Design a protein around this ligand. Structure first.
Ligand SMILES: CCOc1cc(C(=O)N2CCC(N3CCN(C)CC3)CC2)ccc1Nc1ncc2c(n1)N(C1CCCC1)c1ccccc1C(=O)N2C
Length: 112
């Protein structure tokens, strides 16, 4: 179907919005993969088996790798889920993830 392509172009615009700089203050921890070495996190990969970040999603989107909007949404939500599973809920990163996720969920809910 053609409408799948229209949905994916809406998804690409949503990805560009999540990378926009109105959100920089809370989006920056999600720009790049977690660098466990820079952060001192010897236990991250024990909890998080499938790392995800917006930069990886952008390269996947630039390569036509998402065949429907629902695969894209699953990668974005995976990124958040990794953050929420690894970190305690009172952690700043979780508030920041929720602000970015609110942006995502509001925009994704409009796709037909
Ligand atoms: C892209 C910006 O790099 C970061 C820098 C710093 C920082 O100030 N440094 C560390 C580097 C140190 N120098 C410089 C290099 N040299 C090697 C060593 C010395 C100097 C001091 C902190 C977090 C960063 N980036 C991040 N990326 C995902 C996550 C993430 N931080 N948070 C933090 C986000 C903001 C609050 C906490 C997490 C922290 C622990 C566990 C999980 C997560 C998590 O879930 N995510 C998604």
């Amino acid at each position: 179907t053609v409408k799948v392509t229209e949905q994916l172009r809406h998804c690409s615009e949503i990805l560009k919005e999540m990378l926009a700089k109105k959100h920089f203050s809370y989006a920056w921890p999600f720009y790049n993969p977690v660098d466990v070495n820079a952060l001192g996190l010897h236990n991250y990969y024990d909890v998080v088996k499938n790392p995800m970040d917006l930069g990886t999603i952008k390269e996947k989107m630039d390569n036509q790798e998402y065949k429907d909007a629902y695969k894209f949404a699953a990668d974005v939500r995976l990124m958040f889920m990794n953050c929420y599973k690894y970190n305690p809920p009172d952690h700043e990163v979780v508030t920041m993830a929720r602000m970015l996720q609110d942006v995502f969920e509001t925009h994704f809910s409009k796709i037909p």
